[PDB]
Amino acid sequence: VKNGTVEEMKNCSFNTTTEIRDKEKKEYALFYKPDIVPLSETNNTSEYRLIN
Amino acid sequence: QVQLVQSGAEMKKPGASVKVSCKASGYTFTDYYIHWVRQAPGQGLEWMGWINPNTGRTNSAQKFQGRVTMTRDTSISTAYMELSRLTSDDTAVYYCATGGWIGLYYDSSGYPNFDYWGQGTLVTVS
Amino acid sequence: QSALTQPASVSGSPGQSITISCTGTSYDVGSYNLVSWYQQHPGKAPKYMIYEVNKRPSGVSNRFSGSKSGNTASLTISGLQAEDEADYYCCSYAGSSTVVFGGGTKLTVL
Amino acid sequence: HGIRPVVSTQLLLNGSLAEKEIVIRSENLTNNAKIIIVHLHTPVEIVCTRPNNNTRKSVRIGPGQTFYATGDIIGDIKQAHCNISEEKWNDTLQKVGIELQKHF
Ligand SMILES: *[C@@H]1O[C@H](CO)[C@@H](O[C@@H]2O[C@H](CO)[C@@H](O[C@@H]3O[C@H](CO[C@H]4O[C@H](CO[C@H]5O[C@H](CO)[C@@H](O)[C@H](O)[C@@H]5O)[C@@H](O)[C@H](O[C@H]5O[C@H](CO)[C@@H](O)[C@H](O)[C@@H]5O)[C@@H]4O)[C@@H](O)[C@H](O[C@H]4O[C@H](CO)[C@@H](O)[C@H](O)[C@@H]4O[C@H]4O[C@H](CO)[C@@H](O)[C@H](O)[C@@H]4O[C@H]4O[C@H](CO)[C@@H](O)[C@H](O)[C@@H]4O)[C@@H]3O)[C@H](O)[C@H]2NC(C)=O)[C@H](O)[C@H]1NC(C)=O
Ligand SMILES: *[C@@H]1O[C@H](CO)[C@@H](O[C@@H]2O[C@H](CO)[C@@H](O[C@@H]3O[C@H](CO[C@H]4O[C@H](CO)[C@@H](O)[C@H](O)[C@@H]4O)[C@@H](O)[C@H](O[C@H]4O[C@H](CO)[C@@H](O)[C@H](O)[C@@H]4O[C@H]4O[C@H](CO)[C@@H](O)[C@H](O)[C@@H]4O)[C@@H]3O)[C@H](O)[C@H]2NC(C)=O)[C@H](O)[C@H]1NC(C)=O
Ligand SMILES: *[C@@H]1O[C@H](CO)[C@@H](O[C@@H]2O[C@H](CO)[C@@H](O[C@@H]3O[C@H](CO)[C@@H](O)[C@H](O[C@H]4O[C@H](CO)[C@@H](O)[C@H](O)[C@@H]4O[C@H]4O[C@H](CO)[C@@H](O)[C@H](O)[C@@H]4O)[C@@H]3O)[C@H](O)[C@H]2NC(C)=O)[C@H](O)[C@H]1NC(C)=O
């Protein structure tokens, strides 16, 4: 949370529908912080949603 | 003015691990990069890695990044080499050195500006 | 092996000029001015002589200078001296936030 | 004229110069809301960058509708910034001051 002291961007990962309709895979993609919002006030602040 | 102390030589068997240290002196440990180059005895030089000591960041080489887990700590004012799965080829003298000036608004790690270099110490393996 | 190629050795009598050449590719040394030179007299650790093709640190006289052209670069050694019997190493920025060292060449005073 | 349609929120970019002098204008200076545009006599050079050096990943969402995203970051992290030559900025701001005094 602090060892950067410069705008490093988060490293989130999610599930995307692949070319098949009912097959899935785990995939990762970076996003700058203003695009991402936390999903709940719970102590588990490790689940995020796009700002849209 | 500036000098870099390094941990002494040691012996290891193949497949082992080594953790060489590099302690600073004569300059602010933050405001310069820290560097490592490898020299097998009687052979040419080679590059290992970079560290921005103000962070945990590393740029380490493609061939050795899997083999290298170098780190640092500001309290000891020291940057630590680390090696694993150590083969017979790795027998060499490891020189610690100071890189370009670091701050905001640009990245100097590419610059091979090695103003100062350390004692250098030998790892032996066979 | 090194990406960057150097000859084995060169030699000459004192008072004569000598030059050495690096040679890389269009990428790596060919695309940037970030090339540097380092000397290793025997036993001891290497020494810092040139950075950014043609700039000097303190303690390096005007005997030494460098040049770049294409995928190659060079060192200038004007007026060889007796204490010069040492190796010289090339090293330059290889892109991708990585530095590469050449095998260097041995200079021998006659 | 070949109007540049460039979007910008808080300073105009690459616009046309004022030919002879700094000029000031507003629908009704008496009220704050009506923005007091200014059209400068000389340009102020502005430069920006973002030296992180990102890299593009590809992901194959659905039937062949590819989606792009920032992959790994080969390099070292640095701040994204904009630069202006300070003395020129202070000079042009002061001259806008004198023209504001011509209106105030
Ligand atoms: C947008 O705007 C921003 C600004 O907001 C721009 O950001 C700036 O960009 C420039 C360009 O990249 C950066 O310049 C570099 O700065 C570094 C660092 O310099 C600072 O720190 C030095 C160290 O400070 C410490 O020591 C001083 C005492 O010296 C002490 O008082 C202090 O408290 C601290 O403890 C300062 O010395 C230095 O100030 C000096 O130099 C200034 C410039 O000459 C001068 O204005 C000052 O008045 C003062 O004289 C400054 O505060 C520099 O190191 C770097 O210059 C080196 O590297 C370039 C390559 O990038 C090279 O061409 C130069 O020749 C120079 O190389 C020498 O130094 C290297 C290490 O510093 C060394 O590796 C070289 O071998 C060489 O070595 C020298 O010493 C050896 C002995 O050690 C000797 O043998 C040699 O012969 C030689 O003498 C650049 O100047 C700015 O830093 C940066 N701003 C900030 C805040 O970071 C941005 O660029 C803009 N955006 C765009 C897109 O343009
Ligand atoms: C954001 O966070 C995500 C996590 O959600 C993170 O992704 C993970 O990154 C790590 C590091 O890059 C990945 O680790 C690798 O895992 C593979 C596993 O292999 C199996 O699965 C993959 C995935 O499909 C298949 O491609 C593969 O065929 C296997 O089925 C390991 O094999 C990797 O090991 C090698 O690389 C390591 C890198 O350090 C070495 O340490 C290790 O010793 C191995 O090296 C050897 O193999 C290399 C070739 O692979 C070779 O080049 C070397 O020379 C050496 O011989 C590696 O551990 C992990 O898989 C990622 N997770 C997912 C789901 O993909 C992101 O990295 C993070 N964002 C950023 C920017 O870091
Ligand atoms: C920002 O990030 C980008 C990443 O997207 C960085 O761009 C990459 O830069 C690297 C380095 O320039 C570049 O890699 C080279 O691409 C060349 C082709 O254009 C390759 O030929 C070269 O490969 C060498 O090694 C291979 C394996 O050994 C060989 O198969 C190949 O023939 C090359 O080998 C020759 O050269 C090497 C030395 O390079 C030598 O040792 C060999 O003996 C032989 O002579 C490189 O892979 C990437 O292609 C760039 N990325 C992209 C997408 O183009 C960019 O540098 C970053 N920004 C900054 C400022 O660093």
Automatic annotation (TrEMBL), chain A:
It comes from the Viruses. It is found in: Host cell membrane; Host endosome membrane; Virion membrane. Palmitoylation of the transmembrane protein and of Env polyprotein (prior to its proteolytic cleavage) is essential for their association with host cell membrane lipid rafts. Palmitoylation is therefore required for envelope trafficking to classical lipid rafts, but not for viral replication. Highly glycosylated by host. The high number of glycan on the protein is reffered to as 'glycan shield' because it contributes to hide protein sequence from adaptive immune system. Glycans are attached at residues 3, 11, 15. The mature envelope protein (Env) consists of a homotrimer of non-covalently associated gp120-gp41 heterodimers. The resulting complex protrudes from the virus surface as a spike. There seems to be as few as 10 spikes on the average virion. Surface protein gp120 interacts with host CD4, CCR5 and CXCR4. Gp120 also interacts with the C-type lectins CD209/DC-SIGN and CLEC4M/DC-SIGNR (collectively referred to as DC-SIGN(R)). Gp120 and gp41 interact with GalCer. The CD4-binding region is targeted by the antibody b12. Transmembrane protein gp41: Acts as a class I viral fusion protein. Under the current model, the protein has at least 3 conformational states: pre-fusion native state, pre-hairpin intermediate state, and post-fusion hairpin state. During fusion of viral and target intracellular membranes, the coiled coil regions (heptad repeats) assume a trimer-of-hairpins structure, positioning the fusion peptide in close proximity to the C-terminal region of the ectodomain. The formation of this structure appears to drive apposition and subsequent fusion of viral and target cell membranes. Belongs to the HIV-1 env protein family. Inhibitors targeting HIV-1 viral envelope proteins are used as antiretroviral drugs. Attachment of virions to the cell surface via non-specific interactions and CD4 binding can be blocked by inhibitors that include cyanovirin-N, cyclotriazadisulfonamide analogs, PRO 2000, TNX 355 and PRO 542. In addition, BMS 806 can block CD4-induced conformational changes. Env interactions with the coreceptor molecules can be targeted by CCR5 antagonists including SCH-D, maraviroc (UK 427857) and aplaviroc (GW 873140), and the CXCR4 antagonist AMD 070. HIV-1 lineages are divided in three main groups, M (for Major), O (for Outlier), and N (for New, or Non-M, Non-O). The vast majority of strains found worldwide belong to the group M. Group O seems to be endemic to and largely confined to Cameroon and neighboring countries in West Central Africa, where these viruses represent a small minority of HIV-1 strains. The group N is represented by a limited number of isolates from Cameroonian persons. The group M is further subdivided in 9 clades or subtypes (A to D, F to H, J and K). This is Envelope glycoprotein gp160. It comes from Human immunodeficiency virus type 1 (HIV-1). The gene is env. The chain holds residues 132 to 183 of 847 of the full protein.
